[PDB]
Amino acid sequence: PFFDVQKKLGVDLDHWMTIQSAEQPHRIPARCHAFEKEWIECAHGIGSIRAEK
């Protein structure tokens, strides 16, 4: 399955590697920063299928 020890222990020790819009080590963006931020804030609290809608 999938567990949420990443969530319950609280220390997001892998959620920094994951996407852009985080602590890039010296604060620069990537090439497509604002597109990712817009699409994530489009489909954030959405149930993944009306997100596709």
Partner 1 sequence: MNPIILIIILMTVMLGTIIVMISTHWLLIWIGFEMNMLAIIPIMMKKHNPRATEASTKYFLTQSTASMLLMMAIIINLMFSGQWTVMKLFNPMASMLMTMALAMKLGMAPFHFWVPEVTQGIPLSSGLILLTWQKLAPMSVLYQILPSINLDLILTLSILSITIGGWGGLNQTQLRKIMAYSSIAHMGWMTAVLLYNPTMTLLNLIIYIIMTSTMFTLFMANSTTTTLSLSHTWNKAPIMTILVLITLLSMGGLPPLSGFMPKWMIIQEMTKNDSIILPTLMAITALLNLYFYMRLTYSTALTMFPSTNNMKMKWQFPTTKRMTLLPTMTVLSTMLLPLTPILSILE
Partner 2 sequence: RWIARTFFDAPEKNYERTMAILQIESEKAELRLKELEVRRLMRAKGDGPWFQYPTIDKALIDHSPKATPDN
Partner 3 sequence: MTGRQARAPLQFLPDEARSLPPPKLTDPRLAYIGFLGYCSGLIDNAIRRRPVLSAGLHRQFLYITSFVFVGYYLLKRQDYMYAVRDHDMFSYIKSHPEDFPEKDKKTYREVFEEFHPVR
**Helical (H) or strand (E) element with 38:** helix 33-42
Judged by CB under 8 A, the chain residues 13 through 52 that form the site for partner 1 are 14-15, 17-20, 32, 36, 48
14 contact, one of partner 3, partner 2, partner 1, none, CB 5-8 Å limit per kind: partner 1
- How many C-beta neighbours within 10 Å does residue 6 have? 13
C-alpha to C-alpha distance for 22 and 43, rounded to whole angstroms: 18
**Least distance to partner 1 from the beta carbon of 20, Å?**
8
23 contact, one of partner 2, partner 3, partner 1, none, CB 5-8 Å limit per kind: partner 2
